[PDB]
Amino acid sequence: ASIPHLILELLKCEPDEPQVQAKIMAYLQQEQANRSKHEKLSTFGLMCKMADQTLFSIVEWARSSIFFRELKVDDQMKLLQNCWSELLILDHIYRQVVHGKEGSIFLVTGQQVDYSIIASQAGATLNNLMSHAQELVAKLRSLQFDQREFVCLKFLVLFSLDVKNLENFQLVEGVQEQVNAALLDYTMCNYPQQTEKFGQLLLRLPEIRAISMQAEEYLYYKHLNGDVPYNNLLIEMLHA
């Protein structure tokens, strides 16, 4: 596997997935254990909690990453506030590609949930979300989306040209230019038989943004009814 040096730099910033899955699983199981039968978290609450924990992991990943760590705090804030949901979605979708299987949903805890259940025990807005998500997963599986391509898309999502009032906008332009070039070099050399892999991967970014927005609206509605676990990171990003 020929890998551009820049991508090797991006990879050194990646955490151990199986480890992260277990740590979050362990913590959730620990909290439910400390609470009474009269304060047990609902499945929805538990899912929100794991999303919050995943967000923390995402913020730590970014905070320690090359390039991003060079930005002033206020710039880091602006970038993360713009893409937090996109990263959560990209994180979820990649997990489906690597650990999931057709017909089921693989959670960050390592738990798997059949789609049939969701289609009969969930509302229209959520099923619509899962459907689109499922479409995206099917496309990445088809392309044999891999870790090198995954980290490139993460940086392209993080360093968004759409973010305004950034002090160091040049760094965003640089990441966009160089990571796009690195991704193209990578796909051309390792998946030559897929002449359009680079382009097909980029076409997924707008779809990821679209799904993230739909996901936010969904959570926002729950938020208004005060049903989402609060006093956490998930809620602050949503309430913003």
């Binding site: 804030m77 993360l80 602050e236 990003m237």
Partner: peptide, 14 residues
């Protein structure tokens, strides 16, 4: 202001 306190606290840590 209305900025995410937890996020800000995390990014502000060395």
């Amino acid at each position: 202001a209305s900025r995410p306190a937890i996020l800000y606290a995390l990014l502000s840590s060395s």
